[PDB]
Design a binder for this molecule. Structure first.
Ligand SMILES: Cc1cc2nc3c(=O)[nH]c(=O)nc-3n(C[C@H](O)[C@H](O)[C@H](O)COP(=O)(O)OP(=O)(O)OC[C@H]3O[C@@H](n4cnc5c(N)ncnc54)[C@H](O)[C@@H]3O)c2cc1C
Ligand code: HEM
Ligand SMILES: Clc1ccc(CO[C@@H](Cn2ccnc2)c2ccc(Cl)cc2Cl)cc1
Length: 403
């Protein structure tokens, strides 16, 4: 537990760590993987190769230092991290490993600036946080294990169905190879696919939102091909698209995540998604639609019809259910796409254009999609006067972003 003096050093030195983030990250991974190559099966080996994490790291040390006197705010984001670590299968015995290399890295990068006081302070902060996280991750592991259909670590699943949803998004329906029940989850939650990457000669792990409702038998994920156009292709998403088929096997983690609807609630929901960001919205849609009433506004932005996933299914849903409003935005509509017919509005999702349809009293708003899309939606919702507490978001990447 941290003395006042220790927290003050953290507050005074976080900028130094954030400034040297690139070199630290680079040194940390060089050291850790030399000591423990096997850890390369748990981390992302694309990472580009570390840029996104430097951003994450810079934001994370600042926010930590900015909230070190407020344990409640700190507990909340720790929960999101525990959930992500639980999904990856992070183990208490790995905490001393990360710690040594992180500290050895920080020390080697700061060199002369790495005083005893400073190294002592971040080392205590590493330990304080390690403790909290391990306890949270353990409690999450036990809760999955004990529930009907639950498990710890990886369970083998077989692909039963593989269906294209658009040019770029394909669904996979998964049943356990053992043939038993699967655990319940909250709409909005994710699994993690663990699979061997031939090009890498390594296992890689990626999160995917569970895109259908709980049924007790199977899970659905819906995967966007992260393809070419100067940028290198994604590892796992291309692998699922081209090389995984009906009858092949993957490993899955139990459902985790802190982004979801309260199923027992009867208050309304506004579901705002961009592109593949729709995947957890569909699960929330399908659940909320049973039980009086409940009231769902499904607001989706896509490029056009070619890349619009689940297009015919949502359209049919909007004419079968009185409690569902559908609003579709097309950013660059194809010539065969016609407004007032195949989509509602052109351009980006803009909540002002449907303001009275979305501002249901004491609603909950849920946002998923690319970061600038989420800032944009968050901002717009906040200019209508919705309380920060009523806006919920999930990042398809590290972070900690639109915090
Ligand atoms: C909570 C959560 C939920 C998610 N839900 C979904 C979902 O429902 N559906 C879905 O499709 N995805 C979802 N994702 C995203 C998904 O987990 C993966 O990040 C995504 O599928 C890409 O993985 P990959 O292995 O294909 O790409 P990686 O190999 O991990 O590469 C990542 C990206 O960087 C690019 N890149 C790689 N190398 C470079 C380079 N050196 N220079 C520049 N760019 C580079 C790649 O093209 C790719 O777009 C979710 C993520 C999270 C965190
Ligand atoms: C105090 C110790 C730790 C802290 C504060 C910490 C914090 C974080 C944070 C902030 C993230 C990003 C969360 C997200 O993407 O939503 C993360 C991700 C991650 N952590 Fe930790 N973590 C710690 C320890 C560990 C340990 C011990 C392991 C064991 C291998 C580990 C493995 C990972 C992995 C694999 C990711 C995902 C990043 C990626 O995509 O590669 N972490 N952690
Ligand atoms: Cl200089 C420094 C100071 C504090 C941390 C704190 O956390 C580190 C270690 N780590 C990695 C995975 N899990 C934990 C980290 C977190 C998140 C991300 Cl996205 C990258 C990193 Cl490196 C890291 C470098």
């Amino acid at each position: 537990m941290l003395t006042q003096k220790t927290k003050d050093i953290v507050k005074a030195t976080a900028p130094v760590l954030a400034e040297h983030g690139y070199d630290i990250i680079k040194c940390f991974y060089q050291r850790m993987f030399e000591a423990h190559p096997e850890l390369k099966n748990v981390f992302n080996m694309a990472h580009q190769e570390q840029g996104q994490q430097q951003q994450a790291l810079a934001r994370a040390v600042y926010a930590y230092a900015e909230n070190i006197e407020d344990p409640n705010s700190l507990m909340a984001v720790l929960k999101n991290i525990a959930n992500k670590h639980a999904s990856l299968g992070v183990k208490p015995e790995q905490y001393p490993i990360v710690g040594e290399h992180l500290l050895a890295a920080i020390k080697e990068v700061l060199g002369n600036a790495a005083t005893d006081d400073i190294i002592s302070a971040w080392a205590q902060a590493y330990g304080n946080l390690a403790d909290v996280l391990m306890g949270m991750e353990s409690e999450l592991y036990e809760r999955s294990a004990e529930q009907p259909g639950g498990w710890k670590g990886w369970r083998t699943f077989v692909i039963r169905e593989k269906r294209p949803e658009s040019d770029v998004i394909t669904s996979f329906i998964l049943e356990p190879a053992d043939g038993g029940p699967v655990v319940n989850f909250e709409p909005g939650q994710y699994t993690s696919v663990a699979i061997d990457v031939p090009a890498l000669g390594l296992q890689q792990i990626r999160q995917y939102s569970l895109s259908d409702m709980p049924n007790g038998r199977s899970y659905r994920i819906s995967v966007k091909r992260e393809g070419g156009g100067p940028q290198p292709p994604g590892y796992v998403s291309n692998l699922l698209h081209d090389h995984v088929n009906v009858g092949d096997q993957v490993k899955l983690a139990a459902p985790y995540g802190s982004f979801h609807i309260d199923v027992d609630a009867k208050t309304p929901i506004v579901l705002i998604s961009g592109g593949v960001g729709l995947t957890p919205m569909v699960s929330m849609l399908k659940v909320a639609l049973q039980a009086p009433p409940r009231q769902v506004v499904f607001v989706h932005g896509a490029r056009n019809s070619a890349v619009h996933a689940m297009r015919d299914r949502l359209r049919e849903a909007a004419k079968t259910y009185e409690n569902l409003d559908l609003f579709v935005f097309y950013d660059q509509p194809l010539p065969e796409d016609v407004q007032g017919r195949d989509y509602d509005y052109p351009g980006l999702v803009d909540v002002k254009q449907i303001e009275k349809s979305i501002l249901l009293p004491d609603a909950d708003y849920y946002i998923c999609g690319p970061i600038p899309f989420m800032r944009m939606q968050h901002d717009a919702l906040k200019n209508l006067g919705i309380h920060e507490a009523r806006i919920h978001y999930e990042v398809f990447g590290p972070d900690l972003f639109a915090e």
